[model samples]
Target chain A: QNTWINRPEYSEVSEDRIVIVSDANTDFWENTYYDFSHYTGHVYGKETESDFTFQVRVKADFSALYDQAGIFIGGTETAWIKAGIEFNDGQPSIGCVVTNNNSDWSTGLFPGNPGDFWMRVTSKSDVIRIQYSIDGKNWPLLRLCTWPGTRKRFIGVMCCSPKRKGLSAEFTEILLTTP
Target chain B: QNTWINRPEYSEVSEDRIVIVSDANTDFWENTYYDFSHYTGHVYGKETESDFTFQVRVKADFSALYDQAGIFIGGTETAWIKAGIEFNDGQPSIGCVVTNNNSDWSTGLFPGNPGDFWMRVTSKSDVIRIQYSIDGKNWPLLRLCTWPGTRKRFIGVMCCSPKRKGLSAEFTEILLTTP
Candidate 1:
């Protein structure tokens, strides 16, 4: 289990910031082998606890099919959990993926028309609680789950467009604290 | 005098993809008076008659600061060319703001850190070019501009840091093309 406590670092947008824009033709994979070869931006410092709370405010224009972005937790090159917009099924839906040794994704329905949404994730022991908010102050439960295994996890934030180019998602007000 | 030939239809990331975990937060901004409150993504489209070129990228670790991202051309944000990574000096950086706006930014320079690069904006009749690459070989130009008023233009890329959340710089390539 990985969290953002310990010595949580901070990253912001600036003139000198460096983001790894994928190879315009790269994208995310969702098969048995969760291959993460296309992610471009990641500036992490160290790891923290196994159970903690992570929150962020995302403002997106989901007029496109799979325009998605959100918070990712307990993952590496193959295993993790993600909560955000998965532009599949033709509508903007809030979804989550719990990947173990193999890739297994579960999704839930949320408001559409990509506005601003607050995403929260609380991992206690092996039970993970996922929540979302539209106003950033009022959060509603999105999903809950319990996974097995206990290892040093790598948890943080990410935004991706696994299909086309020019897909953009802006995130702000990221709050990662211990509970 | 930079413009795009086609306006891409909005798209989204797939539902089966997962983002890697890292403590990296990035932002985009520009250096002008235009309040970038409505813009979504960066836009760089142009058509070069001879050879035009510019470079820009970002640097950060997950802190929302007054960062800037976009291209600059012609003269000012009102009657020129630009796009991508806006909002600096505590405001949105878009349109003609990047042009004629004078400001200095810090490109984060770490030992083994990665977050710095260049994006070139070139143009031809009915075509503008935008390319980004890590090693310069797989240089993946993101957009081509040829909208309308895009010839004999002083088009280039620029970025800025307008807050406490400083960023790093990681530039690897810069070039120009015609077509």
Candidate 2:
């Protein structure tokens, strides 16, 4: 079963898929340069612990600036990671924001069609590994960094429409596996 | 003055700048995909400790695939980071490879002219912050990740010609400062 932290205004959750309409002005970010804090993004997922691999297929209409949908792994209030396709600089870019006290963003221009993609997040010991694929079978590394905890984390799918409302996002084939 | 680790065959060092021609088939990478190890790249810098900022202007002829020149911060034989402009996918991209045991690469398409750029590496306690700029100002973050140590580190400039030889890289305004 799937649960949500900041439940969206409109969503349909079934046994195998979810569709969410992200509201306006919602995002998860800590202070870095713009000197603002936003933790109002819509997050939907279940809890996980230790070593696990969470995979999902994300489809979204990134029609506005900063419209993002992808996988999120939460460590604490100050430590979390959210990554997927974000519309930035007039192009759809694949990026991630790893937040430890303050958030830092690393992004690359998406090499594939940005409307559909697959993301994988794996937690291995004290590190977190993020990978993405256009075809779901050729997962390549996006970001891998230290996470520094072994506690239970809320791991799931997130969508944020920072500028406008009613950005539709869909998630399917969601799987969470553990060793 | 700067010391060398696996020094290049041709180099010129002055009071404030250094130039080196990277030899053929030399690089710094650990066991990741393509399962190989190369510690043969030319590295020249001074040893630093605790918290500091290292800045340098990098200019290189990144003509071949994987030809890279940038800032290198060495922590151990297996833990280090290299960030700069790397020629990949037929374009010069701003990227970095972080190695703990294995290496992981993250890149973005360079938004500026690839012939010249400045790089900044700042170590704050247990993390490494990387930034880059086309001009001398406006340093945007490239990557910020945990490094997990505060010991003495070899900090300097590095160049690698993974395909063929004669990759000339220039470094100017190389400075290491601490608070």
Candidate 3:
């Protein structure tokens, strides 16, 4: 069993999992104007493994704007990739945000309900791939980008109630397969 | 790690976790006024130990109306105790709805954020106790009710998005400690 890390006050931990009940306006972003990191629901997996696949189902009740929960893999606060569901304006978007020096989002409307979906991440040295699935068996590419070459990079579940309060999520059925 | 009972299309299950991504306006309510029960996130466990502590943490993004997630233990949907957070109006309230021949609700305000919290259920023979905690250490009583004394009872986590399409939740750190 591997352990995870997060803000103590924003998280509840146990032997096998981390429960992050995110507050409103919490997220991780470094951009054209302001650089910031706030209290978001972040739970990570320990023992960084390269050339492997990490998958978990991210489930959350998304009703507010920009509520996001999915898989996050990164090397530092400013360098990461978050891909899953992002509730925009009034719809759910299947997307990924690749953050190397700055950050960029590649988003689109999710064909299925975005609130509950399975997300997968594969890391092979510098390249990283992301996929989303309504069922675990079928994964379509959500985002494919470069990581920190990344653990001082992380792999696990993440969430952000960027526009509202209470971005709750479960990162379960987690399996990490190594090369 | 164990499996749960649910509509295969509505849930995604993996090792040690269950994600209930129920649809909008779907819930369990008996003939007190409304005669309906939608199989929204209908997750049930199969640990037949008659006496034990069934505790789990429920975390979610509760932005929709009546977004509920919590611990459910029972023989059937109509005969069980569902205790956890229920997003009402605009605030998240802590409570339980006990059902024997009929279902009724008992709700109250929680000092902590309603989107995330700890819930523990103790079932000794037929007597069952339900409690809530902000931190897993301090538990206050939510309800003490009678269960179906003699039957094949199942215990596990459950959730519902009763007013909107996406109700995502993680039920983590589940411990079924024996007395």
TM-score of each: 0.40, 0.71, 0.47
The parts of candidate 2 lying over 4 Å away from their true place are B1-10, B14-17, B21-67, B72-81, B86-93, B97-105, B108-141, B144-156, B160-168, B172-179
Tell me the lDDT of model 2 at B138. 80
**lDDT values, one for every candidate:** 0.43, 0.83, 0.67
Output the TM-score of candidate 3.
0.47
Give the local distance difference test score of model 3. Answer: 0.67
Best by DockQ: 2
In lDDT terms, which candidate is top?
2
* Candidate 2, lDDT over the whole model: 0.83
Instruction: Assess the local accuracy of residue A42 in candidate 2 as a C-alpha lDDT between 0 and 100.
Output: 88
Candidate 3 local Cα displacement, residue A2, angstroms: 67
Give the per-residue lDDT of model 2 (tens digit) for A40-109: 8888997776688899999998988899999888877677889999886687888888777777668776
Poorest 10 consecutive residues of model 1 chain B by lDDT?
A: B102-111
Worst 10 residues of 2 chain B by lDDT: B141-150
Superposed Cα deviation of residue B141, candidate 1 (Å): 36
Interface RMSD of 3: 23.9
**Model 2 fnat value:** 0.25
Q: How close is candidate 2 to the true structure, as a TM-score?
A: 0.71
Of 2 and 3, which scores higher on TM-score?
A: 2
